[PDB]
């Protein structure tokens, strides 16, 4: 009831090749979990050269079909189908009862038949997720210090064990092939691989063939279901509170509270994704990333990307503040001037002094920690050859007004507008008040409430008030930005919106008056 | 494959007026999403004279028909039998293609077909959610203190931005109508409102035509769902943790656990709904609002209401304490004494010379800020009139009794009584805490770690050890109440209850001893 | 539409005894909520020897036929059937239109047909939850800080009431007959069981037959569904966010965004649950307790189990350190040394010698306050006979075997030894952080900060900065290890993970900071 009988679904299989017959007579026994997920798969049923037939809007593969390998071309993608794809590019290569296989299957895999996929992903920020991260030495820093510490001489927590369970199973993992390992399975003698950073399935995973990315974020193996994808419960496992509360925004907004009780007559599967006619409910998919065509004119209303920024025109996750999008996925390559020098005097006549050891200083982010006083402008990243390394107005507009686009699909274009008008007032507030909890930090460095030293970057993360300032942007002006983006409500309010802000600011305020009270007593 | 044929859905319809059928031609290409939507709603299928027909329990208009203009008594309700209504008394009223329509429709408007259901509401504090809240001088300056700040001389943060992406999002805003914008659309120039304050679908949002409320909270347009009503879903875009956590509590309680995975055997549609045949376990509405009908005698168990208040004997929100329900919806209109003299000698007694202050002045809030001292009790406000502002004993004994009766569809009596006792000595209990989380805070007033000037009440919020004080009766006492009412259990203790209670007390203490010892040190 | 007749459906039943039929006949009328949900339930609809023909993997009942009751061999299980058993054992037993009934149904009652499950459970640390947090002094410490404050002289909260709605919520109350409530019932004079105490369903719940549980935690009556004792929904009632958040890391885990999406297509009702044939993605019940079968082999792969405690190696809820597993349920009868006399030594040669007072003490936990500092090892804690209190190395590596036995149905074995292994350096790692919170309480303590006293176990909980080291157990390394074992992302990280966690340690260090500063001014 529900029950699939595994041994009747892979006999009424058609087009396996002689390869994956022989992968599958083992393995529905062996793993019968995932011969059954597999079995879900749309791939299990369609091979490239009937895919190639389909009308491009309903299509979803991507290589050509004269540059996917003749054995490939006629047979449905099974087992050994992606698990034997080019052994010589794969470290972890094994023999495997007499075929050449690989358990990681990479993006470089995929490319084989879906290679516009794959391009775009491979330009995202998401496919640099680990350098962005770890090789940026300031959010290294914050790495650290929030996930090592020292114990009676000793430091524990690192890369390969507190960072792994933490910051990199979103973000992603180095995978390293190190060795072999010979086990005995259901009676049978098997050697497995033995990795260092898999499991892993972070958005930045850095492959064994060097390729970047997991595929298997969003629509996970073996299903690899575009109605997964198309869930909210999917980001979920990487977008929550309190840092990046993307689902809990939409959850508790309109489109989430409807979306839970009529998705059960929505058609979640078609691949060119109609409003309306498919849905009456945006997901995370219909905004940021699905292919969407109008019902009745054919129009394409948004172009599928796997390059999630190309519909984003201003970053909400601050670092610290809210900037226009970089133009390029490479992060860890943005530099900026940190203080401008008139406001750094401005600073230091106010005593806080500390601002003037900023002066000239480059720090690899997108924006500057203060504007200038005099322009009342920050100051936005270049890039290693110099060029701006955020997007320009005109792009900024553009973006906006495809977003506008899907709205239109389901309201008048000036609700839409009205939304990311205020929106815009949201960030310039939030940028505002992560100012205010920035010059409170200045004030508890000056004071000596707080250690710092910008040649050990850990330091400026390390301490209670230090984490308080980071929260100010890293939870809160956050939660409110998104929570404006995606019509949440609390988010914005008492979880950990506005009244957590200026909490936070007054829970700075009373540590330093507590502070000076204990010193000139 | 689920997917919703919208030409051929439209050319199926029947009794759709001649107008509607002129908008419907164009809207299915341009808002094909509202379309889609729009046909989902019993109202695209059903006339008033139809509805008419019903057996009373079974009808859900409530206008009688030779009341209803004649226009609209033999068509479906299109998209013109709303949009243009009553075109003079709604000032966004603009031509468009040839018709004079108004985009937000309102609770007079809904009241054309449903008064019944408008009456019940408008009496309601969800109608009058603004004032309530912006119109109270105490509960205006917690709303400033929470969503406003100061950077540089200039404050930031107001009603048309930081207040109208949190606690206006909930509460509602005023709708101003400002003007309008000339677009190009699909092609198409269409001139359209431009407005201060919508799109916002807060419960007491103040419409332009002067009425109160937001008709698409709970049943969003244009589907007017009561599938959605009923779910727990919808009051989740409001009711949620820290501060009224009623969605989180009903999740983790076993009625929400057994809903969750049993609902899809629910009939959630049948307008009159009855316990056991339609359903085993009870939501929101099921307690809140529904019309309840015994399935096997016929007997009434609980009349529908679209006035909450009505079925409440005891405030659970404490302001600043748990308190008898008001009598009517108008909150602001509330006034109670907030000292009783003999408490505030017993406090002075103790040097706690503050209380003084507060002897005979009133305050707009629904009890006062201690009991006295003699009598043990607190006092309870009064109306302009001076009539009590709150129910009586013998009224909250029959509400009780009532809410009973719900649960007796499910439950023995004694095993609901018991709960509700419980209720009481939670209420209690939750209530000596928040008095003595107001005493340390008047001692931090005392010893000047805080700073308060009553005729600037923003002062009594702005402040850490103030919103501490805050959150022992907004976040803590609120949720412990909630899940004892509703069956939680997490809620009650370390998420946002007993343990979050006493450790904010503990948390006060810690502060002012550092204070102290930082004094006379 | 979807809405049951109920009385068609009594109708149909057949194999009804006619005091069951008795019942019916007017309970249908007074209580359509339980007709309806006993209805659904298999047991409305199997005899027990019916239920004895099935083949032994499929059947649901273990009390073998000859020793089942001879009128109770050839009925369905209905309302008679459960609440006429055994009158003479419980104390709860009235006279009820003629029969002799009771309305807790117990642990006992369901052994007359469920003789494995009851001696399963009735070992388990659930059935003694109870005294295992009641009966022990430290825990009841714990309690009693937690529920309990004192306000101008007067002592508020305790077991029947903040306790009851709090922590005895999820561990169970003791239930007392009190007497008996004169009624009148839909016109019916009816007397009821008055009872203290129930209703609750906590696991630990002391019944009035002295039985020990609620069987209607994870499968609730009336409907008693495995599919709903399947859910994570279930679970939920009681394993959530923060201290237990077993619930929460499972709904970002894949394992659950995939079970929400497809669990639609999924046999939850399989007596024999096949991974793969019924279901692909793991809950709760799959890793804990399920008979899981081999779809294809018929080979078992997992008996099932109402003693959770059989399948855990390690306990991962710290008290105050992550453990190896008990061996009994009776966990409040371990006695553990608290501190070893070099560390105590290492300690007061340091400057705090409290340590020195801990010498020689016994506490009823599992594992010391800290490791030897010669040997590096804790000490653990014995039983009343003497005998080691925690499973043998051995053991957890059977049983750690056995998991890694489940996680093969749907991966390689490596892949889910990797995992366990990062579990490892977790439970290390967080045992470290936990000893450095510990450290800095004994210098709170030491210095004055904070206030203890042994022969008051309260006073270990009692203040804020004890309440901050409670959390970096209780809340923090719990929510590591919960996440890191079951696949979570955010609850290891910023929602209560390692930032948290360094984030108190550090929290804990600004306290002292300013406490010395106060001080030495
Ligand atoms: C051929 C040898 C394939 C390679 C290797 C991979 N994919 Fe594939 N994929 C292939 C086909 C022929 C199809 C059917 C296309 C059609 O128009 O019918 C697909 C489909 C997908 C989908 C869509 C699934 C859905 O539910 O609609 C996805 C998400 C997908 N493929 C992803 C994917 C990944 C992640 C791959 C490597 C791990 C991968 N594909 C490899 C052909 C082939
Ligand atoms: C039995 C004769 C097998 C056939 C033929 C194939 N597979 Fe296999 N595989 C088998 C076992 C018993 C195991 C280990 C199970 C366990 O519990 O550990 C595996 C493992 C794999 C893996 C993972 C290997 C690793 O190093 O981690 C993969 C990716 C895999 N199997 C796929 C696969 C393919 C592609 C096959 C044919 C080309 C194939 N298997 C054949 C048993 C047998
Ligand atoms: C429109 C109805 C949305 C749906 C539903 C969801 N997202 Fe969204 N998102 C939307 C907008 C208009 C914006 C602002 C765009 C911009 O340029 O900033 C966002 C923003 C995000 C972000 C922030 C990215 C950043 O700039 O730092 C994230 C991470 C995000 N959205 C993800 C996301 C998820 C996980 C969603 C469902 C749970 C989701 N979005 C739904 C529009 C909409
Ligand atoms: C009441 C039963 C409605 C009928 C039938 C239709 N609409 Fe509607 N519409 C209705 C309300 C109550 C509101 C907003 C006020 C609120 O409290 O929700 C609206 C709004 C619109 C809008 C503007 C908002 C937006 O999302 O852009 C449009 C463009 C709109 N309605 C169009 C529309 C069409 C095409 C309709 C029939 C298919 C239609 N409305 C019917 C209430 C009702
Ligand atoms: C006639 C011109 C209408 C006005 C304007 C509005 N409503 Fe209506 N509504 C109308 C009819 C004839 C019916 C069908 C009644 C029946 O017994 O069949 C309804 C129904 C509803 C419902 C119930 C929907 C359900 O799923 O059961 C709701 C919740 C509802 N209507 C709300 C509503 C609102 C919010 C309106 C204005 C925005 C509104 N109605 C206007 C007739 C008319
Ligand atoms: C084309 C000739 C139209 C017909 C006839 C009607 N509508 Fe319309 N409408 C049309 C467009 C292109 C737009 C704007 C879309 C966008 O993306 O901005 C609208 C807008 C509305 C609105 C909102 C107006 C506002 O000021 O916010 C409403 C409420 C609306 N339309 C409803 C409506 C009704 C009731 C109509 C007939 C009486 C009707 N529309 C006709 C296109 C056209
Ligand atoms: C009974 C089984 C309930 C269901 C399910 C839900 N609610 Fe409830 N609620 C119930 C009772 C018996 C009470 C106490 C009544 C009183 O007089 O206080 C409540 C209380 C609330 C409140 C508090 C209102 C106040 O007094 O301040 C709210 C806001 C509320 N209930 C809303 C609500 C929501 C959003 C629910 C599901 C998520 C919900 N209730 C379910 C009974 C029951
Ligand atoms: C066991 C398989 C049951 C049968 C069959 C029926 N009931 Fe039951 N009932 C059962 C339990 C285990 C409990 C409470 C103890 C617990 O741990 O859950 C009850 C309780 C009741 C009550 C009182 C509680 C309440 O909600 O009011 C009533 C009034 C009740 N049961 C009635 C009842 C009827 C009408 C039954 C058949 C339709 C019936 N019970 C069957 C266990 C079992
Ligand atoms: C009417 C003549 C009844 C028949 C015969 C039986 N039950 Fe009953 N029961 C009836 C009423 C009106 C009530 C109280 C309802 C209320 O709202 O309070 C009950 C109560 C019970 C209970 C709970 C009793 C308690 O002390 O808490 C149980 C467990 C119960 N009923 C079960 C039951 C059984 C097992 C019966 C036949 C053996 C039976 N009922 C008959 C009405 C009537
Ligand atoms: C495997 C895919 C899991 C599923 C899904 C869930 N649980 Fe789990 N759990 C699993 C493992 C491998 C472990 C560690 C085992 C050990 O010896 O520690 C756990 C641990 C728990 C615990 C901690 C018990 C303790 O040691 O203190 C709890 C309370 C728990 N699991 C419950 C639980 C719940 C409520 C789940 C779904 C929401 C759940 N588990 C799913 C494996 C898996
Ligand atoms: C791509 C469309 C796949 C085909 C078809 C199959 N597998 Fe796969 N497999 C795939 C990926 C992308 C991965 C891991 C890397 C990632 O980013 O997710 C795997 C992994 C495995 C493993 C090892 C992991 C584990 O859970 O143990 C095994 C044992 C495995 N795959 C076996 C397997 C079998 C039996 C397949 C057909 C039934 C099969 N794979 C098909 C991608 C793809
Ligand atoms: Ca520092
Ligand atoms: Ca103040
Ligand atoms: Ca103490």
Known sequence: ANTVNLQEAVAKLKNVSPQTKTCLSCHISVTPGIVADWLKSKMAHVTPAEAW???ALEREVS???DEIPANLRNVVVGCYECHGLNPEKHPDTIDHFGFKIHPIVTPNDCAVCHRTEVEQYSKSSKAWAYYNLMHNPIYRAL???????????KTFGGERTSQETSC???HGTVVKVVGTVDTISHGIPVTLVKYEGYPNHGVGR??????????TACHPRHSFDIEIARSPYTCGQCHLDPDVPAFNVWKESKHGNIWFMHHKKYNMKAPAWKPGADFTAPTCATCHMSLLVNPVTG????????NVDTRLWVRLFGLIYAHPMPRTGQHFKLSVEAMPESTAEALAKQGLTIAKALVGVKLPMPISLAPDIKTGKFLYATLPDGSPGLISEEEMAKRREQMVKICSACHNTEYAEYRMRLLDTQIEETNKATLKTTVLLLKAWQSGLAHVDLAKPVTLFDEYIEKLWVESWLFYSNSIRYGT??????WTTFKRGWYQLTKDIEHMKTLLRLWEAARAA
Do not use: W, Y
């Open 53 to 55: 037939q389909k009308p």
């Open 63 to 65: 290589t050509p079909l």
């Open 143 to 153: 790495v650290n210090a929030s996930t090592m510490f020292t114990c009676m001489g």
């Open 168 to 170: 990199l199973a979103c």
């Open 206 to 215: 850095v492959n064994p063939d060097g390729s970047l990315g997991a595929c």
């Open 299 to 306: 129009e394409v209303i948004a172009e599928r990307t796997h």
């Open 485 to 490: 983006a995606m019509n949440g409500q609390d």
